[PDB]
Amino acid sequence: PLGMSQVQSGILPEHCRAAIWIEANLKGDVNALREASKIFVDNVATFQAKFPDAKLGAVVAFGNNVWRQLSGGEGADELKDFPVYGKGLAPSTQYDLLIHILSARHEVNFSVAQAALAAFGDAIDVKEEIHGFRWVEERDLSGFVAGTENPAGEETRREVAVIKDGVDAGGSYVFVQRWEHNLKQLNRMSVPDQEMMIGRTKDANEEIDGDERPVTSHLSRVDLKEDGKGLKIVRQSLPYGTASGTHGLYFCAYCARLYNIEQQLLSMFGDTDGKRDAMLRFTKPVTGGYYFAPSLERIQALG
Amino acid sequence: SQVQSGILPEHCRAAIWIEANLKGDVNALREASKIFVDNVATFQAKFPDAKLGAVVAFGNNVWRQLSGGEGADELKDFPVYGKGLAPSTQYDLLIHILSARHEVNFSVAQAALAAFGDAIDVKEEIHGFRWVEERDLSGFVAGTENPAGEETRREVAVIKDGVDAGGSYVFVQRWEHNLKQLNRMSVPDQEMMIGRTKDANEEIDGDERPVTSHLSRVDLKEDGKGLKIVRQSLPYGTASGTHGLYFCAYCARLYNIEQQLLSMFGDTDGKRDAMLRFTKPVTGGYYFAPSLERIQALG
Ligand code: HEM
Ligand code: HEM
Ligand SMILES: O=N[O-]
Ligand SMILES: O=N[O-]
Ligand SMILES: [Mg+2]
Ligand SMILES: [Mg+2]
């Protein structure tokens, strides 16, 4: 549709059961990312045509250094390399390229991931590939329901995640961060203590009032308002891993303003008020990066 | 004697395999196995749509101890085949979980680990998934000639009588595919390597395909009697890292599996399976899956 800016298909879908994230560095000349990105989004359209019931979406997104090159420095004014927070409590592993694929069918996501790798070829060095899965009752592996207060429905998710006007219209900022859960440590905590750590009840998933939970509770850290206006984000996080090996949450969020994500990280990691998130008692982040997801027509026009 | 629930279900969408060694007292496996099979029954009741099943199976040394040397006459440690071309990684314990729902399998695998606790040392945990059109990652449909329906699957996989009635022998072997090597082959050449056409999945006449084709290696008859097995194999891995097929088969006789391995790996006639051009096995083990009644009678 001329004069408009179409969002990449992976930002908005809700309740998808499976995802693949690929994070990679650029190995050679940045020009190689131009044709590869166009091939990949075309492949996504082909898979959507072949598998209409998968409800597939995907996003290509770029780190600061390569996006500044590809854009000539226009727009994406908030973009920067992911900093450390809490002096290293949240480590930084900023890469050049993020691919996020999500759908109702893991097997379709796998084919799409293979297509991404064929498009980019040896221009990229893959740093990790994570297969996310929705767990029972949409719970995080800790046993708490994850997603309840996420923006709901296309209209509100667009408001929160999608830039509305100007050169970046239809684009979004992305944050990804892989957490490694220590479930043995979690299971040493009583359920009441776990509920004070999160800020919601475990079985029934009821919010515990802000004046009845510690300021270190996760909800107290991240449910932030500025003069009454919530700093909302669109989360796409999923569980990942093996039962006997590494497992946790692959955190992913989209926002039209990087600012909202950063304020939540400054809060969680001790930089705002000297207190940190209680979830650090059982889980820790081991990666972190910021990316810019251009509109689809900005990709299709790379050249 | 009732069969363990994971042998017979067809067309699973996802599986988890856990291979482990015994670190503690062999007697710890008795109570743990009973706990786990009860967990599986509870999960089936909670998730009836999942069509969940699971199997606990034991390596030769531990099974001889748990059984007092009675039955399981064919059981032995997995040897190398082809003098080492197929490696051997025999462990003490196999747990196989399968269903329509990966997330249910994950909860079941956590329950297995809780039941066995620190008596076991996990050596491998593999998450299988059914790919598009039930194809192996090579692009060839996998499973077409597998026994179909409970009647025939019981005939092939489940021991009929005696002390082992309701049990089965299990073989597991992880393969690592090199899809770059595969993709350098023309499609006609790939078809002659497998023995079936790629898109349409039609058998190529045995008289017109190479004797090294996969089907010529594994579709074996003895005076016209097919040496059938029940395969539960699935794709696994990451797109950018290691990926392949996790091969898994059940049979009432270990013999049928072993004859296929001797054929594939050059021991029978000096010829090897043509798929070794692009994929290779990296683990291998044999296990005995007792009936449920036998498990209940352990401790
Ligand atoms: C180990 C990692 C994490 C776990 C297990 C986790 C878990 C949860 C849970 C259980 C909830 C409550 C239900 C819900 O409304 O979704 C929640 C809410 C939320 N989380 Fe997290 N989370 C993690 C990391 C993060 C990070 C890193 C951020 C932000 C940078 C974040 C932002 C949010 C937000 C904004 C909410 C909604 C709060 C509200 O408005 O009520 N989470 N999370
Ligand atoms: C890389 C590993 C393997 C791959 C990709 C593979 C793939 C295939 C394919 C594409 C077929 C044809 C369709 C079908 O009927 O299922 C097939 C058939 C079969 N495979 Fe394999 N296979 C592998 C390993 C093995 C092993 C290790 C064995 C036995 C020990 C085996 C036994 C069989 C049998 C019995 C059949 C049916 C043959 C017939 O009666 O037509 N396969 N396999
Ligand atoms: O709130 N973590 O998706
Ligand atoms: O024939 N391999 O499942
Ligand atoms: Mg709130
Ligand atoms: Mg035949």
Residue numbers in the entry:
A (entry chain B): -2 to 300
B (entry chain A): 2 to 300
Which passages does the manuscript contain on this structure?
The enzyme investigated in this work originates from the human pathogen Klebsiella pneumoniae and belongs to class B. All structures exhibit a dimeric ferredoxin-like fold typical for dye-decolorizing peroxidases, composed of antiparallel β-sheets with four β-strands connected by α-helices. In all DyPs, the prosthetic group (i.e. heme b) is coordinated by a proximal histidine (His-215), which is hydrogen-bonded with a fully conserved aspartate (Asp-268). The fully conserved distal aspartate is responsible for deprotonation of H2O2, whereas arginine 232 is important for maintaining the distal heme cavity architecture and might support heterolysis of the O–O bond by transiently and electrostatically interacting with the negatively charged distal oxygen atom.
Exchange of Asp-143 by alanine does not change the active-site architecture. However, in D143A, the distal access channel is significantly bigger, whereas the surface exposure of propionate p6 remains similar to the WT protein. However, in D143A, the small effect (+20 mV) seems to reflect the increase in exposure of the heme iron to solvent compared with WT KpDyP. The variant D143A is unique in showing an alkaline transition (pKa = 8.6) to a HS hydroxo state. In the absence of Asp-143, the apparent bimolecular rate constant of Compound I formation is reduced by 3 orders of magnitude at pH 7.0, and the pH independence disappears. In the KpDyP variant D143A, the rate of Compound I formation increases with increasing pH, suggesting the assistance of hydroxide ions in H2O2 deprotonation. In addition, the restricted accessibility via the small distal access channel might contribute to the observed poor reaction rates. This is supported by the fact that in D143A Compound I, the reduction rate of thiocyanate was significantly enhanced due to both higher reactivity and unhampered access, as indicated by the crystal structure of D143A. In any case, during turnover of D143A, Compound II accumulated, suggesting that Compound I reduction rates are significantly higher than Compound II reduction rates (k5 > k6) in this variant.
